[PDB]
């Protein structure tokens, strides 16, 4: 079964990904030398908590507080927490679309908490990665895969009504789910994901998962190819597969990252190096890596730099107890 180290690892990895990623958000300019330089500077900063979190963590904290409060999953409670969190701290770096959902949820006009999301972008719904960026904790709370799928979907559908948005969230939740389940081989991990997403989609996400397989069978794949084929975007389709690739790639040495950085550190460094939506791709790859390698790879020097590290650790313990209760 899942250990405390794994739940702690997942959440801290997600926080690190968000906080460190934020440095480089929306940049066509990022290459690995800058990330390594940034990390060296980070690891000798005298003050703790210099890196502030973004919408990624803010929404993550709301998910977690909903699961703890309503462990059978209460989407009305979760929507309320998203909307109140936004209201309290609107400048955290939210999507331009999703702001309209929060205001609609805060008004007394909607009895149906899914309806604001359905109305997004001319009724097509958002295909953004905001559903996925906050979903890891679903997989940390619910052992059963069928729960992980349905609750990933519903948590996502509060903001992301498009199949790309909510299926992106399911994929990210499944990636954490399967990373939790033993030191599972690379090839087993992927088989599991492709299997599930083929059933769920039918295939955009499956297509990208197959590309990941291809890339992982080659060596020294340029980052240009990864960005071209997988993306580094705010779209779920162009970020969730990318996060998964970053996790899988960094299970082995990358010749450009010193091997004195552990696998989780490597994963975060590599993720950020891909550019674009650096906070979300790194928060997602970091959640998966955290679940896989556990808290042993979340180094004191790194975690101390993050806003809300203590609260995050505390919430990991609470999530672990929820998980244990569900067995
Ligand atoms: N269906 C769509 N049609 C046109 N544009 C879309 C559509 N769906 C999403 N987008 C674009 O994607 C952006 C983000 O989607 P939203 O639902 O607003 O927000 P969300 O996915 O939470 O944003 C995640 C980002 C990740 C970082 O940029 C900060 N937060 C929108 O403001 C649009 O620009
Ligand atoms: Mg962000």
UniProtKB/Swiss-Prot annotation:
InterPro entries: ADP-ribosylglycohydrolase, Ribosyl_crysJ1, Ribosyl_crysJ1_sf
Activity regulation summary: The protein undergoes a dramatic conformational switch from closed to open states upon substrate-binding, which enables specific substrate recognition for the 1''-O-linkage. The glutamate flap (Glu-25) blocks substrate entrance to Mg(2+) in the unliganded closed state. In presence of substrate, Glu-25 is ejected from the active site: this closed-to-open transition significantly widens the substrate-binding channel and precisely positions the scissile 1''-O-linkage for cleavage while securing tightly 2'- and 3'-hydroxyls of ADP-ribose. Activity is inhibited by calcium.
Chain sites annotated for binding substrate: 55, 124-130, 160, 234
Gene label: adprs
Keywords carried by this UniProt record: Chromosome, Cytoplasm, DNA damage, DNA repair, Hydrolase, Magnesium, Metal-binding, Mitochondrion, Nucleus
A GO cellular component entry from the record: mitochondrial matrix
Family the entry assigns: Belongs to the ADP-ribosylglycohydrolase family.
SUPFAM superfamilies: ADP-ribosylglycohydrolase
Any one of the GO BP annotations: negative regulation of necroptotic process
Site (Glutamate flap): 25
Cofactor note: Binds 2 magnesium ions per subunit.
Name of the protein in its database record: ADP-ribosylhydrolase ARH3
Enzyme type, top EC level: hydrolase
Function: ADP-ribosylhydrolase that preferentially hydrolyzes the scissile alpha-O-linkage attached to the anomeric C1'' position of ADP-ribose and acts on different substrates, such as proteins ADP-ribosylated on serine and threonine, free poly(ADP-ribose) and O-acetyl-ADP-D-ribose. Specifically acts as a serine mono-ADP-ribosylhydrolase by mediating the removal of mono-ADP-ribose attached to serine residues on proteins, thereby playing a key role in DNA damage response. Serine ADP-ribosylation of proteins constitutes the primary form of ADP-ribosylation of proteins in response to DNA damage.
Gene Ontology molecular-function annotations: ADP-ribosylserine hydrolase activity; magnesium ion binding; poly(ADP-ribose) glycohydrolase activity
Subcellular location: Nucleus; Cytoplasm; Chromosome; Mitochondrion matrix
Required cofactor(s): Mg(2+); Mn(2+)
Effect listed in the UniProt record for changing residue 55 to N: Complete loss of activity
